[PDB]
Structure formats: structure tokens, C-alpha cells
Amino acid sequence: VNSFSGYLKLTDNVYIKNADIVEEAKKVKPTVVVNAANVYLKHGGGVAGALNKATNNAMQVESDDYIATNGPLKVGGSCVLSGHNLAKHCLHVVGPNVNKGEDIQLLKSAYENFNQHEVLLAPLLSAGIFGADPIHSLRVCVDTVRTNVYLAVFDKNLYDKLVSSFL
Ligand SMILES: Oc1ccc2c(c1)OCO2
């Protein structure tokens, strides 16, 4: 049993809810929250900007030190950093950004990072301002992630479309 509430069950391991990922993290304090990161860990907008704002910019400060030491992530890659006030850990995962021309086949590699964690609170990778089709992102998630993933979909309209089109 875990603390996640109000989710619709899609599969054995994937759950979904219409929720503000920031507000969900603040309530649950999950072991892992996933950030929709870019390779520079520049948390300007979208899910990343919202998560970082909720940490009072402490996520960005930590991220800048990580990049100064290690250099940029790979598209499809990840790193584990602090979850600050939102979670124990933040898994920063880089899905391909269609608005930068990145290979959508890298979305499966991005979701494979989730398999290193038994339970996660996450957004749909490459959705929103990353430009991919969220229906596609949900299908890759279900077909790639084997650990238990609780998806927070910010848009009520999109949530209803994801559920009503789910195969
Ligand atoms: O994709 C998003 C998810 C949550 C957000 C957001 C964007 O901006 C405000 O909070």
C-alpha cells in the first residue's frame, strides 16, 4: 500500500490523475518525483519551472553545481538529485524536445530511467512545451516502465482525452 490517492489504474503498474504535479508532490512527499528536465538542467518553464519555483530556486542552485561538475545530460538520460521540499529525490529525466528537432525514438530510452526506481510520481515525458503527442507519451510509458508510476496530468481536458483514448 502507498499514499497516492484518486488515481485511475491504467495497467498493473501505471496510474494516472488530473493533478498539479507540484501540489501532488507537496501532499505525498514521494520517494521520487520526476522532473521534465533539459540537458542543461535549466528549469525555466513547464513542469521544470514549476517544480523549481516550488523549491524557491534551490533545485536550480543544486542543478548548476551538478552541471559545473559533470557537464550536460544526454537526451534520453537522467540524474538523481535532491527532492528538496517536494520529495526525497528528484529524478531529472530528459525526454526529446520536438521543438528542438530531437529523435522521438529517444522517448523510450528516457522512460527506461524510471525502471531504476520502485515507485515514482511523474509527468508525461516530452509532453507540454517539449512538443510530443501526449497520447504517444502515455503509450511509450505503459510499454516501457515496469515499476509503479503515478502520472500527474496538469490539463483536465488532456487528462480526459488520455483516459478516453487509452487502449
Ligand atoms: O506541465 C506543467 C505541469 C505543472 C505546472 C506547469 C506545467 O506549470 C505550472 O505547474
Side-chain angles (χ1 to χ4, degrees), residues 1-26 28-166:
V1 173
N2 67 50
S3 159
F4 288 107
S5 177
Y7 288 71
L8 175 70
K9 181 172 182 58
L10 293 175
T11 70
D12 181 58
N13 67 297
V14 178
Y15 295 79
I16 196 166
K17 185 185 180 176
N18 176 218
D20 176 324
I21 199 185
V22 171
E23 287 312 311
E24 191 75 3
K26 280 199 290 192
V28 176
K29 292 290 238 88
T31 305
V32 181
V33 65
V34 174
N35 182 33
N38 59 52
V39 294
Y40 305 109
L41 302 179
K42 286 172 56 91
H43 308 305
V47 165
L51 292 168
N52 174 60
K53 176 178 180 187
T55 77
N56 180 46
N57 211 51
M59 178 180 284
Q60 191 64 67
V61 170
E62 179 195 32
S63 292
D64 290 347
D65 169 86
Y66 174 88
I67 297 288
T69 299
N70 300 108
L73 300 177
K74 298 170 180 184
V75 178
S78 70
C79 67
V80 180
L81 291 173
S82 181
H84 300 278
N85 56 317
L86 303 180
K88 185 173 200 281
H89 305 288
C90 180
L91 182 70
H92 293 273
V93 180
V94 185
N97 187 329
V98 177
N99 305 318
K100 303 181 175 171
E102 296 167 351
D103 170 18
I104 195 59
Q105 298 308 136
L106 288 170
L107 186 54
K108 187 171 183 77
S109 301
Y111 273 116
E112 288 170 342
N113 298 286
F114 289 24
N115 289 321
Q116 299 294 318
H117 302 278
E118 286 192 356
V119 184
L120 314 88
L121 171 63
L124 286 167
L125 299 180
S126 297
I129 69 175
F130 281 62
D133 176 4
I135 296 172
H136 175 67
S137 183
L138 178 56
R139 182 29 63 188
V140 178
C141 180
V142 160
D143 292 345
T144 306
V145 179
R146 298 177 300 284
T147 58
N148 293 323
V149 57
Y150 288 85
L151 294 169
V153 178
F154 186 78
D155 196 271
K156 171 58 165 152
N157 182 293
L158 171 61
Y159 171 84
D160 285 349
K161 180 172 138 123
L162 285 167
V163 167
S164 72
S165 59
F166 183 70

